[PDB]
Design a protein around this ligand. Structure first.
Ligand SMILES: N#Cc1ccc(Nc2nc(N)n(C(=O)Nc3ccccc3)n2)cc1
Length: 272
């Protein structure tokens, strides 16, 4: 990771928080191409000082993403580890996370929008699967909307997958349980079961989010009831707009070996 000086970063408004992290809009002063000076909008992800022990997993998350280059994977500019802070410096995506975009735009997002976003996510996960790289935290909050759909120009929406954050292989047990049903049942049983098949399950959950206008599946269940949901081998309800319901359940297969490759997922998406 390229090291960025604290003096070159300006922290502006908070944009929320993630697991043991706080998120800020910021500005990076930098010398760019041809020696031109730029003041670039950036997304600054700050690991909580009280959780500095998760720094290696905080940064191994992004670093994996950033050893590969792909149009659907978020760009990391570098890190700032001056002083006591652990900061990931990331491209700033105009329209933020998909989970909140889906909510604020329910009565405006149709099946063709959801299908194109689903295809793009499948393309990014296919690229990861071909490179045998595990993401570990596929969810709507981790999908960034680069570009809105512009019907008047034929332009589809364009999304990127963000970095996974601290791995579920080191997170507290209660956080993992609150992440049901994104975290697969085999990883609730044993977090060290994290596997390429993990992302197939979470991709199913993420499609459910995309089809459900920002609702969180099982949000009404507390952690104990979510565990029992897995113990009784339940599937999620079909979204009202059920066009993707079969793919969702096919991906969320309690047998990890039976979950379809992302190539087959793309083939099924292209038939709708
Ligand atoms: N209101 C508003 C707003 C919020 C965010 C953004 N933009 C933006 N750009 C990036 N790269 N982003 C994230 O990686 N986010 C994130 C993902 C997971 C966990 C925590 C944060 N988020 C733009 C607008």
């Amino acid at each position: 990771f390229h090291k960025i000086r604290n003096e070159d970063l300006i922290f502006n408004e908070s944009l929320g928080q993630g697991t043991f992290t706080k998120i800020f809009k910021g500005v990076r002063r930098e010398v760019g191409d041809y020696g031109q000076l730029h003041e670039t909008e950036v997304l600054l992800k700050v690991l909580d000082k009280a959780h500095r022990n998760y720094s290696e997993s905080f940064f191994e998350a992004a670093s994996m993403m950033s050893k590969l280059s792909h149009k659907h994977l978020v760009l990391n500019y570098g890190v700032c580890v001056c002083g006591d802070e652990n900061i990931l410096v990331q491209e700033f995506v105009k329209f933020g996370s998909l989970d909140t975009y889906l909510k604020k735009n329910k009565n405006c997002i149709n099946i063709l929008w959801k299908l194109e976003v689903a295809k793009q996510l499948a393309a990014a996960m296919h690229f990861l699967e071909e490179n045998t790289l595990i993401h570990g935290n596929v969810c709507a909050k981790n999908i960034l909307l680069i570009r809105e759909e512009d019907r008047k120009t034929g332009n589809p929406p364009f999304i990127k997958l963000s970095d996974p954050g601290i791995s579920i292989t080191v997170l507290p047990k209660d956080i993992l349980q609150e992440r049901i049903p994104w975290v697969p049942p085999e990883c609730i049983e044993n977090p060290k079961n994290l596997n390429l098949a993990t992302d197939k399950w979470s991709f199913g959950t993420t499609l459910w989010e995309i089809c459900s206008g920002g609702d969180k599946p099982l949000s009404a269940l507390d952690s104990q009831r979510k565990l029992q949901f897995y113990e009784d081998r339940h599937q999620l309800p079909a979204p009202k707009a059920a066009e993707l319901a079969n793919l969702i359940n096919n991906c969320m297969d309690y047998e990890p070996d039976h979950r379809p490759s992302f190539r087959a997922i793309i083939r099924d998406l292209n038939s709708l």
